[PDB]
Design brief:
This is part of a larger assembly, with two copies of chain A, one copy of chain C, two copies of chain D, one copy of chain E and one copy of chain F. By secondary structure, chain E is an all-alpha fold. Chain E is built from two helices and no strands. The two termini of chain F are 45 Å apart. Classes of the chains: A mainly alpha, C alpha+beta, D mainly alpha, E mainly alpha, F alpha+beta. At the C-F interface, helix 2, strand 5, helix 4 and helix 10 of C face helix 2, strand 4, strand 5 and helix 12 of F. The complex binds cardiolipin, 1,2-diacyl-SN-glycero-3-phosphocholine (2 copies), phosphatidylethanolamine (PTY), protoporphyrin IX containing FE (2 copies) and dodecyl-beta-D-maltoside (2 copies). Chain A: Keywords: Electron transport, Heme, Iron, Membrane, Metal-binding, Mitochondrion, Mitochondrion inner membrane, Respiratory chain, Transmembrane, Transmembrane helix, Transport, Ubiquinone.
Chain lengths: 273, 55, 402, 124, 63, 438, 124
């Protein structure tokens, strides 16, 4: 539980780091994405507006905001490296889990040379993917509007986050209330912290659980659909679709996984009697 | 077992700032190490803040 | 103690005027009846473990709510399980004994984790006294099997769960069970035992494998934890005169910071040793023992020679004063044995199980100087003397020296 | 979930004729598609063991059961890393899939749960 | 010198009223005052320092 | 319902107190004195203990040998013990050997020879015992505990006394001590078992009538101790077992919190790994200690004196690397007496004590000890009904109130003996006497 | 430097009449101004102990010498933290400043140095 819980914080720190780094270009998407995302803080009751002006260092996103985002963007990766190390120190008490979900205390292998050399394979696979983007298609994953200098007057046609934030944006849009939407979006990440509780299985992991595997597959594909819905226009029928997908996202943690894991426990016991 | 000893993360902090066994007769010249830690913390806090306003 | 019978179980109770009752189950299951070495000790330690109606844990938590206490011990003849509680809580305690005798789940994990570790600490605590060891070794030499079996479980002879389960099948049976209630209304106990122990098997009387045989010899036990020496004499015809003889010979003091007027107490003069004459009536056989503990092995050697001489001197002739002292001290010994619940339980237990009618302290016989001297003479001239040395055994006496 | 919970709920179902008629066939197909028997495991080999209760129950296993469990874990680990399935005698047959561990863990948990209840008793 | 039951002399240091509430209260007054000044000093420090992030004078001039 | 304790006085002021039992055939008769080592100064410290030796060294009439013979002829035994505030001299005999044992006691107390030769012979004996008490670890720990808790006070002195005093105690000092302290108004003749009260009173009139009365007769059990938070460390790396006692100032015999302190003591309770039932006890500390193997044993105590007491725990442990855990969890259980105890723990402990207080009185000696103790400390034998009522009056509110004034954030006296490198300094132990979360 | 070196060089000096006449008085003054005796130390208590050789020599001390050394270290530590000097019997007198450790460490080092030499022997 502890390496997983520190992992959830690592993920939040990654999001903040990448958000601030994207603003630094100060193109159209940089400015307008900063404006919309920082105005979510205005939803905090009573003090929200004051907090936003304090974050910006002024009354809109401008020079003070950019200079502070640079300093924090430089810092946050160092913080993230510390938490990455912490989650591995926490893991080192139990060791790595494994795909069967059983103990490995019966049969251990040294990290080197076995996993050192196994890691090199994917290092080179990664470098090949990296090569194809950086050298042959360096702008495929970006937004053309970020090659226009920031202009507070002109509003871009569509303000969307970077692709990796899109599912969280779709969850926010699903709730009509401003504060509601903010809470849901944060909750969508913080709810990962309750997996250790809502999973009622007596067995670790899904390798041997056909129904859990099907549910997991639906959960993953729903998360990708939320990502796609994060960058469509707010139009029919995507509005209702985004709400159904949002409900399914939360019901995986709150209803489906606890039900399915309970029933599978019974099926394993009765099935093997 | 006390949590400070049982939990591996807490135990690392415990080992340096709490249960760490020290000689009983250190004089005030053993205080410079923590003053250096204080200078470092001030430089990080002030330096990162200056970086928010410096060009 | 009014002896009666309730559903085939012998029940003896004596009402009193006190808020505290003692209920004891005496079992014919002591070490002389043991099938495997140590099983009677392990069975004793298995009492009040998990039963089918009530776990060990639940029993202890409830016992605390009644403020009751539990005492158990093993002898060569019996296992004694005793509870002490407030008078009114009698039905709970009768039912708890019934659960133990009928429904003990003898689980392997209890043996490994609970019972055997406790049995091992029990023995180590007793052995801290080298006199305990010396007197145990003397029984082993003198009787070999039966009375010569160890009372306690040892590491060298492991008791298995199947051993303990088999022995319990024999022992926990109406034929081997006696109930003794101190400060218990006799009619109330009979009614309760009659309902609770009705479904206990009848079983059969556990018997000693083999007849009691008497032997002589030596047992040198090297310890580094202090020095003792037992000079024991196995008796084929246990007589009550040996009780008076032990009391006469003596060994301990009857006042603080003193040696004592007893022959054996006057054998320790000038040393830091302690003597103790002890007669062990065992029905078919007996053992008269003179245990001398001390720090210095040379000091023990000295007292040991004076001890043997004292016995010979007694055998020659004793005076009327000495005879009166023997009787007075023996009557007192009988009185306090019938008082202490530990020994009280076993005394009536022997009357109920075996048949040996108890000798009331007021009926302790007065032995003439002639009868005492004759008893000592019969011991000094024994063909099978036992000597058990414990400690620095190279520096302790041998049988042929004594 | 506690093994106790799973065992008791299953027993409620097995009691009900209707329920058993519909649940037992589903449970048997579930176990077939689970495919743990194709790595030579018994069902109880999959139970999470990193808890005090389970470590206690594993220490109470008879030595032979304990040595055989070690072998089945090592053998399954070797099939997993090789991406192979058991064949022949290595496949667990339905008659070999015995609940060797369930009785030990039920006793450990019975004590643990009684201890919790008794820690909260109120003298009336 | 030899007997360990004869406690060494602590009379130069011992207070007569060591068991009283007044005695303990005094030392907690010192600890409390120190905690109080540390809380007030922390609050001042945090407030003054973090105010750097609020609009600077040149930003407020153009508002 | 036990028989009533009968009580009579003589003219000099000697109390006679008896509790008959028809079932037994043996009777304990003895003299409980409200005097002990506390009544000595620093110059005659050890006199009371010295006298106990010389009491059995020969009288005005009978020699030591004759004394031995006489007791042996009765068939029973004589026994004596001296504590800080109480001295006892009893004689367990047969029913019919009660009068003769009474005669022997009156003689050794009123007319002991105290021969100079006998004094010199005892000097060596007592000197040997001084360098032999080391073996009894529990006694060492408790003697140091009193020495430190009542630093430089009469309750902080040892019973045996210092080596220096042992070499200088004279027959004059001995005579003065027993003339000042063994007075009739401070003495109770106690009978338990097969005794007739009326017979015992006659024997008292025959033997103890010429006892001096004190000039100022105060009531029995009449006493200012100033507790010192402090520690004694007797580190010995060669010992395998650490022995640790921790105490706060507790309650006197007549405190209004006497029973509340006993209930609080019972909530923590005792533990011993050698007893089979101990792993199943209800006590929270017992569960922590047994599950984690933190100790071989612990024993809670609430020791009382006329004007003070010590309440605490005595631990023995071979787990030398987790001594910190043992002490930590012990003091966290004490904290709960002030912060968390509810009706549950309190009612459980009261249930246990209701029996325990009666259970203690087993044999005739146990009964005699109870009568004697209660008569010399309270001035009366408290009936079981009164004790049951005082226990019933202890509420959870009383325990919490008592703990908050007596334990919470209080100075402790701490003694450690053996491999105690793992025992932290005073501050870290004393910091566990409160919880920052509360 | 090795204790061996120090002891041998000192012995060279003590042999030479001239050298001893000039060095011994300086060494005695040095020791007086050093002031370790005013904390109740003996000179050998100051030798660096965190070496394999020294840990071996300390293990070879007779138990009595070893227990007394422990006490002198604890007592000096208490004077140091209190900023006090020894008084009375706590001050080490010149006659009490015995080289209790030197013989043990010289034997440890003799073996260690012989081992090094013999590891480099060449059969002729
Ligand atoms: C920069 C940031 C600010 C923070 C300040 C931290 C400085 C504290 C510190 O390390 O020095 C205090 C320090 C007091 O520390 P201490 O722990 O009491 O004693 C340390 C010495 O080893 C104890 O030395 P000692 O016991 O031998 O006493 C010597 C000292 C007397 O030290 C006293 O305090 C007296 O007096 C002198 O040496 C003065 C020289 C005479 C000149 C005329 O002052 C000195 O002793 C300075 C001596 C240096 C020359
Ligand atoms: C898209 C839907 C994916 C469904 C996966 C179902 C299992 C499957 O077939 O996978 C093959 C394998 C099956 O492996 P396995 O370990 O279960 O089985 C190995 C073979 N046996 C059973 C014989 C032992 O699954 C994996 O390797 C799954 C890893 C999951 C990674 C998901 C990444 C999605 C990112 C979104 C984050 C939010
Ligand atoms: C810098 C922040 C200062 C915050 C001060 C708030 C109160 C805490 C404090 O001063 O310490 C009191 C407390 C307690 O000090 P203490 O441990 O001396 O008091 C405990 C004993 N009683 C409760 C009986 C007085 O400190 C803490 O709880 C830790 C906070 C440190 C600041
Ligand atoms: C301005 C900031 C400094 C002031 C904060 C200090 C604490 C304020 C009062 C609180 C206090 O005294 O209580 C103690 C808390 O101290 C603590 O727990 C901390 C003790 C000292 C505080 C910081 C330690 C500095 C050491 C290294 C300096 C590093 C400098 C590098 C930046 C606990 O009292 P107790 O714990 O003794 O027990 C006693 C029983 N609960
Ligand atoms: C950012 C700079 C530094 C920090 C924060 C720091 C911190 C500390 C601390 C906290 C200690 C233990 C407490 C103490 O003795 O003061 C310590 C000890 C030590 N430091 Fe530093 N230090 C720093 C720089 C240095 C430098 C530059 C050196 C050496 C050139 C050094 C060498 C040591 C040594 C040898 C010790 C052990 C001293 C001893 O206890 O005897 N440190 N340091
Ligand atoms: C060991 C830690 C550090 C030391 C010794 C240090 C030292 C210095 C010094 C000597 C200056 C010149 C100051 C002046 O005269 O104006 C300076 C300036 C600066 N430092 Fe640092 N620094 C440290 C850490 C940092 C950190 C962590 C940052 C984070 C960015 C930072 C940011 C700055 C900036 C922006 C300036 C220029 C503005 C100014 O002069 O004040 N420093 N630093
Ligand atoms: C701002 C810094 C970022 C976070 C880093 C935290 C402090 C640095 C810890 C890394 C060092 C860990 O390396 C290791 O940790 C263990 C775990 O406590 C510690 O172990 C130490 O304490 C434990 C118990 O407290 C003892 O049993 C052990 O004998 C001792 O070596 C030591 O410190 C070190 O041997
Ligand atoms: C981890 C912390 C999380 C939450 C903490 C929130 C703190 C951030 C709020 C910054 C508040 C600044 O609030 C403002 O501060 C300055 C001092 O800084 C005050 O200014 C006042 O004192 C300063 C000096 O200290 C003078 O220059 C000034 O003339 C006077 O008005 C204002 O009266 C106050 O309104």
């Amino acid at each position: 539980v502890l390496p997983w819980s520190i992992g959830v914080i690592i993920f939040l720190l990654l999001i903040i780091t990448a958000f601030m780094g994207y603003v630094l270009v100060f193109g159209q998407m940089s400015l307008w994405g900063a404006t919309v995302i920082c105005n979510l803080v205005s939803a905090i009751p009573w003090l929200g507006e004051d907090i936003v002006h304090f974050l910006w260092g002024g009354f809109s996103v401008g020079n003070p905001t950019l200079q502070r985002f640079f300093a924090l963007h430089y810092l946050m990766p160092f913080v993230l490296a510390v938490f990455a190390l912490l989650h591995l120190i926490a893991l080192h008490t139990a060791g790595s889990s494994n795909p069967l979900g059983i103990t490995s205390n019966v049969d251990k292998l040294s990290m080197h040379p076995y996993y050192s050399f196994k890691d090199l394979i994917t290092v080179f696979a990664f470098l090949l993917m990296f090569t194809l983007f950086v050298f042959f298609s360096p702008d495929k994953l970006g937004h053309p509007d970020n090659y226009i200098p920031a202009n507070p007057m002109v509003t871009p046609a569509s303000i969307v986050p970077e692709w990796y934030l899109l599912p969280f944006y779709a969850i926010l849009r699903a709730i009509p209330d401003k504060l509601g939407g903010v809470i849901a979006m944060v909750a969508a990440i913080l709810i990962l912290l309750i997996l250790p509780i809502v999973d009622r299985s007596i067995i670790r992991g899904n390798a041997f659980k056909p129904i859990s595997k099907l549910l997991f597959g639906f959960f993953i594909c729903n998360f990708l659909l939320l990502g796609v819905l994060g960058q469509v226009h707010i139009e029919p029928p995507f509005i209702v679709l985004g709400q159904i997908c949002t409900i399914f996202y939360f019901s995986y943690f709150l209803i489906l996984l606890p039900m399915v894991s309970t029933i599978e426990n019974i099926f394993f016991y009765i099935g093997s009697l | 077992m006390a949590l400070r000893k049982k939990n591996s993360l807490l135990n690392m902090a415990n080992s340096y700032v709490l249960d760490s066994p020290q000689p009983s007769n250190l004089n005030y010249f053993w205080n410079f190490g923590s003053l250096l830690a204080l200078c470092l913390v001030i430089q990080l806090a002030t330096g990162i803040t200056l970086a928010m306003h410096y060009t | 103690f009014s002896t009666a019978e309730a559903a085939g179980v012998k029940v003896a109770a004596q009402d009193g005027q006190s808020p505290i009752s003692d209920l004891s189950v005496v079992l014919r299951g002591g070490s002389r009846y043991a099938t495997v070495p140590g099983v009677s000790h392990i069975l004793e330690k298995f009492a009040f473990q998990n039963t089918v109606p009530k776990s060990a844990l639940r029993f202890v938590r409830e016992l605390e709510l009644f403020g009751g206490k539990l005492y158990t011990h093993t002898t060569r003849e019996h296992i004694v399980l005793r509870t002490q509680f407030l008078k009114q809580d009698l039905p709970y305690f009768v039912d708890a004994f019934a659960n133990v005798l009928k429904e003990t789940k003898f689980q392997q994990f209890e043996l490994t984790e609970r019972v055997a570790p406790v049995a091992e600490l029990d023995l180590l605590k007793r052995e801290s006294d080298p006199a305990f060891t010396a007197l145990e070794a003397a029984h082993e030499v003198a009787f070999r099997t039966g009375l010569g079996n160890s009372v306690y479980a040892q590491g060298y002879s492991p008791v298995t769960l199947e051993d303990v389960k088999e022995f319990a099948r024999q022992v926990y049976a109406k034929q081997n069970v006696a109930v003794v209630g101190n400060n218990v209304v006799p009619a109330d106990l009979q009614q309760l035992v009659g309902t609770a122990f009705a479904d206990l098997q009848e079983g059969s009387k556990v018997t000693q494998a083999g007849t009691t045989t008497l032997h002589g010899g030596e047992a040198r036990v090297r310890t580094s934890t202090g020095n003792a020496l037992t000079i024991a004499l196995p008796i084929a015809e246990p007589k009550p005169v040996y009780h008076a003889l032990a009391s006469f010979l003596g060994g301990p003091a009857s006042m603080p910071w003193s040696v004592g007027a007893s022959p054996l107490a006057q054998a320790t003069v000038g040393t830091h040793t302690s003597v103790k004459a002890t007669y062990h009536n065992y029905g078919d056989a007996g053992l008269f023992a003179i245990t001398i503990k001390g720090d210095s092995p040379a000091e023990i050697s000295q007292v040991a020679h004076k001890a043997v001489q004292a016995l010979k001197d007694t055998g020659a002739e004793v005076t009327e004063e000495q005879a009166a002292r023997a009787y007075a001290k023996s009557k007192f010994a009988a009185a306090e044995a019938f008082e202490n619940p530990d020994s009280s339980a076993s005394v009536i237990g022997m009357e109920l199980l075996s048949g040996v009618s108890r000798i009331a302290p007021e009926n302790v016989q007065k032995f003439t100087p002639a009868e005492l001297s004759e008893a000592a003479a019969q011991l000094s001239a024994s063909a099978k003397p036992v000597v058990a040395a414990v400690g620095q055994v190279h520096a302790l006496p041998f049988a042929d020296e004594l | 979930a506690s093994i106790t919970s799973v065992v008791k709920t299953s027993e409620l179902i097995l009691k009900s004729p209707l329920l058993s008629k519909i649940v037992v066939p589903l449970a048997k197909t579930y176990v077939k598609f689970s495919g743990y028997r194709q790595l030579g495991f018994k069902m109880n080999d999959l139970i999470i063991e990193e808890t005090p209760n389970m470590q206690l129950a594993l220490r109470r296993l008879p030595p032979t059961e304990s040595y055989d469990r070690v072998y089945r874990l090592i053998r399954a680990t070797q099939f997993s890393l090789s991406h192979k399935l058991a064949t022949g005698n290595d496949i667990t047959k339905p008659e070999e899939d015995d609940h060797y561990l369930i009785p030990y863990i039920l006793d450990v948990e019975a004590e643990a749960f009684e201890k919790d209840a008794l820690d909260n008793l109120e003298v009336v | 010198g030899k007997s360990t039951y004869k406690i060494p002399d602590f009379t130069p240091y011992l207070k007569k009223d060591r068991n009283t509430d007044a005695n303990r209260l005094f030392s907690y007054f010192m600890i409390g005052s120190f905690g109080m000044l540390s809380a007030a000093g922390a609050k001042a420090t945090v407030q003054d320092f973090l105010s750097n992030m609020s609009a600077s004078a040149d930003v407020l001039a153009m508002a | 319902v036990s028989p009533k304790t009968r009580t009579s006085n003589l003219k000099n002021g000697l109390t006679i107190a008896s509790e008959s039992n028809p079932l037994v055939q043996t009777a304990t008769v003895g003299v409980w004195i409200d005097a002990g080592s506390r009544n000595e100064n620093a110059y005659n410290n050890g006199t009371a203990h010295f006298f106990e030796h010389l009491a059995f060294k020969g009288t005005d009439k009978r020699s030591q040998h004759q004394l031995e013979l006489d007791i042996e002829n009765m068939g029973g035994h004589l026994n004596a013990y001296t504590s800080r505030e109480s001295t006892v001299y009893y004689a367990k005999s047969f029913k019919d050997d009660v009068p003769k044992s009474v005669e022997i006691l009156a003689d050794i107390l009123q007319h002991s020879k105290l021969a100079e030769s006998a004094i010199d012979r005892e000097r060596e004996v007592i000197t040997r015992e001084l360098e032999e008490v080391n073996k009894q670890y529990e006694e060492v720990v408790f003697d140091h505990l009193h020495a430190t808790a009542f630093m430089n006070q009469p309750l902080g002195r040892t019973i045996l006394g210092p080596r220096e005093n042992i070499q200088t105690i004279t027959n004059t000092e001995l005579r003065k001590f027993i003339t000042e302290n063994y007075t009739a108004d401070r003495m109770v003749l106690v009978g338990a078992g097969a005794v007739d009260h009326d017979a015992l009173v006659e024997l008292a009139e025959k033997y103890f009538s010429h006892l001096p009365s004190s000039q100022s007769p105060v009531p029995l059990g009449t006493p200012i101790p100033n507790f010192v938070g402090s520690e004694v460390r007797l580190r010995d790396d060669t010992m395998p077992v650490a022995h640790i006692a921790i105490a706060v100032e507790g309650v006197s015999w007549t405190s209004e919190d006497y029973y509340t302190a006993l209930v609080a003591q019972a909530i923590i309770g005792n533990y011993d790994r050698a007893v089979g039932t101990s792993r199943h006890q209800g006590s929270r500390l017992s569960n922590i200690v047994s599950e984690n193997n933190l100790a071989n044993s612990f024993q809670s105590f609430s020791t009382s004196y006329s004007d003070t007491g010590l309440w605490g725990i005595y631990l023995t442990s071979e787990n030398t690397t987790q001594i910190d855990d043992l002490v930590h969890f012990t003091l966290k259980e004490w904290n709960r007496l002030s912060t968390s105890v509810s009706n549950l723990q309190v009612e459980r402990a009261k249930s246990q004590l209701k029996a325990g207080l009666l259970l203690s009185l087993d044999g005739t000696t146990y009964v005699a000890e109870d009568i004697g103790r209660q008569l010399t400390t309270l001035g009366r034998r408290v009936t079981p009904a009164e004790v049951e009522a005082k226990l019933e009056a202890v509420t959870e509110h009383d325990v919490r109130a008592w703990a908050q004034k007596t334990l919470y954030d209080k100075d402790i006296a701490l003694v450690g003996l053996g491999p105690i490198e793992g025992l932290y300094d005073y501050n870290r132990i004393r910091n566990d006497m409160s919880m920052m979360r509360w």
